[PDB]
């Protein structure tokens, strides 16, 4: 019943994964072929998180970046909601750690520099993530990473003392991003225990292991990041153009997005109107409503065709 208005527009295949207060399956656009990662939650299981779902939403409608998984849809029924997503067909850079064992540092930056994009123009945008962690960062395509999962935006290896501590939204992104780092190059947590408030107190204490193959310089870093008071922690802005970070490239982090919505894609209007039959200026006004429907979905699916360097085209 709540899928029959889903299965008008994708056809659903397997399970991907399960998170929390969500499942998400891989699906086919119908209209595009294209595959898309379709999150559903039911709105009568978690009712009284339903708010902080609806801001999660209108969150990844104000996020359009180069590492962030895109928004394409949403469809409300009775009792579900339905975000149709990006697929990012590498999965979780979680899974990828764990086959590598750990990243050397060169790989680590490469990965690094994406995670810190992403979360400085979500930042830059006014809003911290609050959960990151490597089951909400994956692989695209091309191994580039899109960082998901915006339902916490404004788990306890990856918070910083002072949110633990109910008391700084970008600092604590920083010092989640600090436990990243670690685990990208070491394979482990810093800290990390059976017992709950055993993590909390290594957590407060903020001493960690300091393997034998990290480099000074990562060495450094995280120090820098894993500063359990806030005012003493590296700041964003100085994360941008670390040595560390800088090493090889030269050049700051580049934060700001490549793929902003500017004016519509001609081509992709082009195409709808042709494959509506319907007048090219009442489509402009339609998709230009930009109520992340159906048309939203398939306009910005035929984006995604261009920007992948494939035709422009409807079946
Ligand atoms: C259990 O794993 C997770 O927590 C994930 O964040 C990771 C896992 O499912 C979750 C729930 N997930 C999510 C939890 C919340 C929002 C989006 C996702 C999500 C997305 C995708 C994938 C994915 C792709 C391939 C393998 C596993 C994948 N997952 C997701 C997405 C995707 O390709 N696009 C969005
Ligand atoms: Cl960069
Ligand atoms: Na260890
Ligand atoms: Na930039």
Redesign the pocket.
Same mark, same amino acid.
């Given at each position: 019943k709540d899928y029959d208005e889903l299965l008008k527009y994708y056809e659903l295949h397997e399970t +991907? !994964?399960?998170? !929390?207060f969500?499942?998400?399956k &891989?699906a086919c656009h119908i209209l595009t072929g294209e595959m898309?990662?379709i @999150?559903i939650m039911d709105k009568n299981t978690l009712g009284s998180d339903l708010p902080r779902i609806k801001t999660e939403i209108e969150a990844l409608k104000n996020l359009r970046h180069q590492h962030i *998984?895109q928004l394409y849809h949403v469809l409300e029924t009775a009792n579900k909601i339905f975000?149709v &997503? =990006?697929? *990012?067909?590498?999965? =979780?850079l $979680? %899974?990828y750690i764990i086959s590598q064992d750990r990243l050397s540092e060169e790989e680590t930056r490469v990965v690094f520099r994406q995670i810190v994009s992403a979360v400085a123009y979500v930042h830059s945008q006014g809003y911290a993530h609050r959960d990151l962690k490597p =089951?909400?960062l &994956?692989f %695209?395509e091309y191994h580039k990473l @899109?960082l +998901?999962? $915006?339902?916490l935006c404004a788990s306890l290896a990856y918070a910083a003392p002072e949110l633990i501590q109910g008391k700084l939204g970008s600092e604590a992104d920083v010092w989640s991003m600090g436990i990243l780092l670690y685990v990208l190059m070491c394979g482990f947590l810093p800290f990390d225990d059976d017992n709950v408030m055993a993590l909390y107190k290594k957590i407060m204490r903020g001493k960690y292991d300091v393997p034998k193959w990290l480099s000074p310089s990562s060495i450094l870093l995280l120090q820098q990041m894993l500063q359990v008071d806030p005012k003493k922690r590296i700041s964003m802005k100085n994360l941008l153009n670390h040595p560390w970070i800088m090493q090889d490239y030269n050049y700051p982090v580049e934060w700001q997005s490549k793929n902003p919505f500017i004016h519509l894609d001609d081509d992709c209007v082009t195409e709808l109107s042709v494959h509506h039959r319907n007048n090219r200026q009442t489509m402009e006004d339609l998709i230009s409503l930009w109520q992340y429907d159906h048309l939203t979905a398939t306009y910005l699916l035929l984006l995604a065709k261009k920007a992948r360097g494939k035709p422009v085209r409807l079946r």
């Open positions: +991907i !994964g399960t998170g !929390g969500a499942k998400v &891989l898309v990662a @999150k *998984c975000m &997503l =990006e697929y *990012c067909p590498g999965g =979780e $979680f %899974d =089951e909400n &994956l %695209d @899109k +998901i999962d $915006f339902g």
